[PDB]
Structure formats: C-alpha cells, structure tokens
Design a protein around this ligand. Structure first.
Ligand SMILES: Nc1ncnc2c1ncn2[C@@H]1O[C@H](COP(=O)(O)OP(=O)(O)OP(=O)(O)O)[C@@H](O)[C@H]1O
Ligand SMILES: [Mg+2]
Lengths: 287, 50, 209, 28, 100, 101
C-alpha cells in the first residue's frame, strides 16, 4: 500500500457549480459536497457537485439538517444511476487557497471513513475571465513525518504545473498534507457544443447596419482624425535630441501621436470594408 | 437555567466586529469606493442582496 | 498568446484594492505614488495601463501587500465633497431680488459672459478676471444673489463653507483645497463659491504656537 | 505690551500595517 | 544700462524652511554672473521680520534669512559693480540702525 | 417640559476644545441632528462665551472662537434654509454681541 502520482479528473458541470455557488456566497466560506467515483488506485474522477442548506458567520460556516443529505442522494439514484461521494469543497475568498485549521479538522473525519477523500479549494475572486484558480489537497499523517509518503516513480506530480506558491506553503506544503494535480476530461458530445455558442443565425451575417449612422460615424471619426494629424505634424517635426528614453519619459502624460493614428485607421477600414462587402452580396445573391 | 446562560455565551464568543465606513461613490455595479473613518480609502463590493 | 497574456495579468486587481494618488514617474515603467495611508512609496506599474491617463495627480489603485500601480481610477473619484447635486436649488428666482439692477447685471456678466466673448478681452488688453469679491454691511443681499444665481444657471456649482478645512490633523487643510480645485478642473465650466473667507484670509502673521 | 495668550493642539495622524498572513480562529 | 533684477519674494518664499538658507546664495551668484546688475527689493522683509521680537521663542525662520542677508553684505561687495535698491512704506519698524 | 423628546439644550461654553477644528464639528452635527428630526428646538443659554463681537487681529485663540462663531452665521442663513427649526437665545448683556448675529 502506497501513494502514486495521482490525478483528479473532473466533470465540466462541476466547475461551473463550484464558482457560481462560490461567487453568490462571496464574503464567507460556502460549503458543498463532491460526488464522483474511485476509478482506480491511481486517479480519481468527480462527475457531480451539489450543495446543501447552510448557516454561516463571518469567520465560520456550518451545515444544517442531515435529513437533506440522504434524501438528496436517494433521488439522484433513481433518476440517472447511483454513485459515490468522493470528497467535498469550499471557498477561501481572496485568500491564499490553503487549508485552514478548521478545514483540516473535518479531514480526519473524512479520511477515516473513506481513504482518498479529497479536499478541494476554489476561489472566485483571484479567478479572471482568462483562467480559474482551482485547487485540491490531500491530507498526510504526522506519524510518518520522517518516513517517505510518496514513492515518486515519475515526474508528473513533482515539477509540473508549478512549484508551490509562497502564500500557500506558508501554512501547508509540504507540512500536514500534499497537493495533487488536476486536469480536464471532455466527452466529445459536450466538446462539440462548448465550441459553438457565440455564433448567430444568418440574420446577423447579412445586416447592413444603417447608412445614416454609418456615414455619421465616418463623419465623426475623420473629424478628430484631422485634429490628430494637427498634433502629429508638431511632434514628429519637433524631435529634441534628447536620447529617446527621455523622449519616452516626457510622453507619459497627455502625449499621443502615432497611437490613435494607427487606431482610427483600423476602425475606418474594417467598418467600411464589411459595410461595402455585405452590400455587394445582397445584390449578387438576391434576384 | 444557568446552563442556558452558558450556551448563549458559547454562541457569543465567535462573533467578530465589523469596520464602520462611509460610501464615497459607486464605481460599477459591484465596485464601490468607501472610506474608513480613521483614514484611508478602499475599493470594495457588496454581497448580493443589499 | 499575447492577448491571452494580457487577460491573465488581470487577476491582480480582484477588489481588495487600496487607493493612492499618482505623483511622478522616474523612467520607463516605474513611478512614485502618494498613498492615502500617509506615507510615500516607490512602486512598479503594469504594462497594461495606457499612459495617457497620467498627471492630473490622478487617483490610482494600489495593491495591499506589495503596493504597486494596478489601476487608474476615474479622476473625480477621490474628491470627498460633491457639487450642487441634482435638486437642491434653493428656490430663489432671478426676479425675486428687488432693486439690485446694477449689481445683478454686473455679476451676471462677470460669470457667464467670458465663456462666449473671451477674445474681446485680449483685443482690448483687459486680461479678464479670474475671481470676484463681494462685501458690504451684514444683510444687504450678499448671500441671496449667490443663492439666486445657482437656480438660473446650468454650470457646475460647488458651495464651500468658510472654515471646514481646519481639522486637527497635520495637513488635511491643503489636501482639501487640492480636492476642490481638481474637481473644478475635471468637471465642466464650473463656479466655486466660498462664503466667509474672513475666517481664513487674515492679515496678521504666523504666530509660532 | 503686557498681554498673555492661550494655546492649541495639532494632533498628528496615525497608520498601521501588517503582513496579514495570520488567521484569527484557534477556537474549536 | 545694467541688468535689472526684480525680486518680489514676498511670503511664499518666507515659509520655505529647507531652501530658505540658499535663496540669497545663488541669487547673489546670479548677480555676479550675468552682468553689472541692479537688484530691486520692497517691503517684504519688514512684513516678515524686524528684529528679535520673534526671537528666542521659535526663531520664525524669517529673521534667520535676514541674518544671512546681513551675512553676505558684511562679507564683501565694495559694490564691485552692483548696487541693491529697496523701497518701502512703514519705514519705522525694521532694524535700520545696525544697517546704517 | 411640554415636548421632553425634541429639545436640544447647549450651555454654549463646553463647545470649545483643545484641537483646531472639532468645535465647528459639534455645530454641524447639531443642526444635522436638528435636520433629521423635523420639528426641533435649539436652546443656547449665555452666548457671551461663544458670541463676542470682533477683535482687530489679536490672539490666535480669538481666531478659533471667531471661526466657530461664523459657522453659526453660516448655518442660520447660508445656503441651506431651515424648516421647523427654532432657536431660543438667552444672555445677560446684549451689547457685547456681534451685529452680524
Ligand atoms: N434686495 C432684497 N430683496 C429681498 N430681500 C432681501 C434683499 N436684500 C436683503 N434681503 C433679505 O436679506 C436676506 C439675504 O441674505 P443676507 O442679505 O442676510 O446675506 P448677507 O448679506 O451675507 O448677510 P450676512 O452678512 O449677515 O451673512 C434675506 O433673508 C432677505 O430677506
Ligand atoms: Mg449672509
């Protein structure tokens, strides 16, 4: 009996259930269970995530009646299939995504019941529209603090995905627990429809916006573009021999030639080309 | 009856006080500029249902 | 990938942000800000911020722990005082004042007219006035004329008490004067009215106490 | 010529800061 | 036909403590650098300070500047090409007896 | 003794303090509390401490009193008018008072 390089599989429904419950309960830790399957002794797979009614404070959060718990799993068995709890999750809002002193106290509760019970940390605050800060941890004993805890037969959970962050090892790594890797499994069926949800019908592809405002927008943009050219004559001619990093310090301020001049040309280009070219097709195609 | 007083004090201990400040202006729907009474200014947010 | 790289920087804001004010810039991508925590720092700035937003002494956002320039606020944010808001016109019509036809006409052209006929001053060589002073016996309509001109105007109007910036701190007084005048420069053609400057504009000297 | 005076006070401001990596529970 | 130098220097410079000990220094460098020059003054010191009235009770930063005015004029001119001119009302307040 | 809920009494001598502001700051809070409850009564016995007339640039301590005095001359007439706010004033000598008051 030994650990390995473990891997946390997910479901795509889970991560959206993670953050939306986290964002809607932002100024405190919000709690939930995590529901999946132990596919082997090496990797772990969650497929479902649900919450429970709770009761919180500013510093602590508690659950309420467990009659909600077994009745929830009962009605998830008869619709779909039966499944297995694998762990749980909560949030650390704006924190360093690290297991707290009460967060660790519910883990000897969970690791004694099932072995590979995963604690999962989410933060909907340090997560931007580019990327999510998801996190998952796995408790280790203190009795084996001298003896080795992982046999380390590969490189996949050692130097990959980061070295551990300084604000998370200040409480954790590698004392009292160990981190674990997370990837994203994708079925083909949802993968195909997760691709195409930002497109429209042919109505949007064949509009002709309106020629009054389109000429008005062209009348607008060229008019200040004249004034940008007024300022552009002065600065390019000016060029005090100043070793141009000093040119590059006297330009932070109000100074902006050559920057709007590339910008408005791009706007006047892509507007006029598409407005012409879509009006081209509505005569060739139609009648 | 004396045990009921002790259980109220068990509940009373884990309460944490809150900072008092004044709202300067509303930046966006979830960004707000407030100011603590002792000094400096911050950028904050509400919860959901305020 | 560079546009994916710009978006992934943006976790640094996340709104526990503190507010300073921009002061100066040394060189490329390194500057000086003055915090509202009292002290003064030497910080680093993000490559994301467009450099056109700088030097009004702009209100800026700063990180808590590491204290770097992260965001540029709207410039009217750190003001701590407001103008005549939306509806507090004191309900005094222009014809409510009786028989001040010299002085009602004089102040009205002292304020509204150089918005239009500015170059008639320079062609004569007048150098048009920035400010106007009013005085007299106590109750000859000094406040009412300034009270009436707010009702029948459209410009930004900021009422100012005589002696409110006299707080017991170190230098809040000159900080509040900067807060007023940046707000007048930022908003509009504006009108600043400071009633009772006798509380401050005294003659005597600096008694060192 | 022989005239006394009173006085006044201009109290300084105060500010504090920390590393803020300390948790405040320890209870439970 | 001399280089006129007008110094207003009324009270906005009287408050400036840290550079108050140099504003006369490089100014008299400017007079001996440019030309045969003539420096003009006005009531500004007499409104600032006269004598030891604001003396041991805090030094008020302004009479200390006046002691540096007297320091350089004691140092060496013999006019050399440069006069200074001062014009005032409220004539009977300052310390002219030491300056006679 | 009729109202017993909506009556403000001021000794007009405990207003002063040791700081520079902080005496006006009471007066702003008073009228704003008098702004919130609508039918308020203000009573300041013995104005002659805070009242005075004028001094020709004397002590800086006099300038603290006069700046405190001019906050009353503002916020009785000023910009913001008053409604249902009545001010009873009492003194022994009225000759020493400011004619602007
Ligand atoms: N020409 C006028 N027409 C109508 N009412 C007037 C006129 N002149 C003065 N008043 C009266 O004077 C008041 C206008 O404000 P006031 O003249 O008191 O301001 P002020 O001159 O600054 O006084 P103070 O110097 O005492 O603050 C109003 O209450 C009004 O009743
Ligand atoms: Mg008035």
């Amino acid at each position: 009996a030994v650990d390995t390089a473990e891997q946390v599989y997910i479901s795509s429904l889970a991560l959206l259930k993670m953050l939306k419950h986290g964002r809607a309960g932002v100024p405190m830790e919000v709690m939930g269970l995590m529901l999946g399957e132990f596919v082997d002794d090496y990797t772990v797979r969650v497929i479902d995530v649900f919450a429970m009614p709770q009761s919180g404070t500013g510093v602590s959060v508690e659950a309420v009646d467990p009659v909600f718990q077994a009745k929830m799993l009962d009605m998830l068995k008869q619709t779909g299939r039966p499944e297995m709890v694998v762990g749980w999750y909560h949030s650390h809002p704006g924190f360093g995504c690290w297991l707290s002193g009460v967060d660790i106290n519910t883990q000897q509760s969970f690791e004694a019941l099932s072995e590979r019970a995963v604690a999962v940390v989410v933060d909907p605050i340090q997560s931007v529209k580019g990327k999510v800060v998801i996190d998952a941890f796995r408790l280790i004993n203190a009795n084996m603090m001298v003896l080795g805890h992982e046999p380390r037969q590969t490189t996949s959970n050692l130097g990959h995905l980061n070295k551990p962050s300084i604000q998370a090892l200040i409480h954790g790594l590698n004392r009292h627990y160990y981190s674990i890797t997370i990837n994203y499994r994708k079925n083909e069926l949802e993968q195909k429809m997760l691709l195409n949800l930002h497109k429209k019908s042919w109505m949007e592809g064949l509009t002709l916006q309106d020629y009054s405002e389109h000429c008005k927008h062209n009348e607008s943009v060229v008019k200040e573009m004249l004034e940008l050219a007024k300022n552009y004559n002065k600065a390019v001619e000016e060029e005090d021999k100043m070793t141009p990093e000093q040119l590059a310090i006297k330009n932070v301020g109000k100074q902006d030639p050559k920057r709007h001049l590339e910008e408005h040309v791009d706007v006047l280009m892509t507007s006029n080309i598409v407005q012409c070219l879509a009006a081209m097709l509505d005569t060739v195609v139609f009648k | 009856k004396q045990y009921e007083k002790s259980e109220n004090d068990l509940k009373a201990l884990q309460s944490v006080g809150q900072i008092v400040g004044e709202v300067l202006k509303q930046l966006t729907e979830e960004k707000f500029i407030v100011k603590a009474t002792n000094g400096p200014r911050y950028v904050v947010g509400c919860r959901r249902q305020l | 990938e560079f546009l994916h790289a710009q978006e992934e920087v943006k976790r640094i804001q996340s709104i526990p942000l503190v507010i300073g004010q921009f002061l100066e810039a040394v060189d490329q991508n390194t500057a000086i800000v003055g915090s509202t925590t009292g002290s003064n720092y030497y910080v680093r700035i993000l490559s994301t911020i467009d450099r056109e937003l700088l030097k009004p002494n702009a209100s800026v956002a700063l990180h808590k722990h590491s204290n770097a320039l992260v965001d540029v606020l709207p410039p009217e944010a750190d003001s701590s005082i407001m103008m005549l808001t939306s509806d507090q016109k004191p309900d005094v019509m222009y014809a409510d004042i009786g028989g001040m036809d010299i002085q009602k006409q004089e102040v009205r052209e002292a304020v509204e007219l150089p918005l239009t006929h500015f170059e008639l001053y320079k062609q004569i060589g007048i150098d048009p006035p920035r400010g106007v002073l009013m005085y007299g016996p106590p109750g000859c309509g000094k406040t009412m004329l300034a009270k009436a001109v707010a009702h029948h105007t459209t410009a930004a109007f900021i009422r100012v008490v005589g002696s409110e910036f006299v707080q017991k701190y170190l230098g809040e007084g000159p900080r509040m004067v900067r807060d007023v005048f940046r707000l007048a420069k930022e908003n509009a053609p504006a009108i600043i009215f400071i009633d009772e400057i006798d509380a401050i504009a005294t003659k005597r000297f600096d008694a060192q106490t | 010529x022989x005239x006394x005076x009173x006085x006044x006070x201009x109290x300084x401001x105060x500010x504090x800061x920390x590393x803020x990596x300390x948790x405040x529970k320890x209870x439970x | 036909d001399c280089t006129f130098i007008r110094v207003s220097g009324s009270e906005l410079v009287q408050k400036f403590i840290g550079e108050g000990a140099r504003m006369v220094r490089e100014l008299f460098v400017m007079a001996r650098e440019h030309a045969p020059s003539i420096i003009f003054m006005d009531e500004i010191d007499s409104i600032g300070s006269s004598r030891l009235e604001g003396g041991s009770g805090g030094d008020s930063e302004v009479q200390r500047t006046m002691l540096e005015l007297l320091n350089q004029l004691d140092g060496f001119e013999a006019t050399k090409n440069i006069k200074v001119i001062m014009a005032t009302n409220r004539i009977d307040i300052l310390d002219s007896a030491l300056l006679r | 003794s009729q109202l017993d809920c909506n009556f403000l009494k001021v000794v007009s001598s405990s207003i002063v303090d040791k700081y520079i502001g902080e005496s006006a700051r009471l007066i702003r809070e008073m009228f704003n509390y008098a702004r919130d409850h609508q039918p308020c009564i203000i009573f300041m016995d013995e104005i002659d401490a805070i009242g005075g007339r004028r001094f020709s640039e004397g002590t800086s301590a006099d300038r603290e009193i006069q700046r405190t005095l001019m906050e009353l001359l503002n916020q009785m007439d000023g910009f913001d008018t008053l409604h249902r706010v009545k001010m009873i004033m009492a003194t022994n000598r009225p000759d020493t008072l400011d004619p602007a008051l």
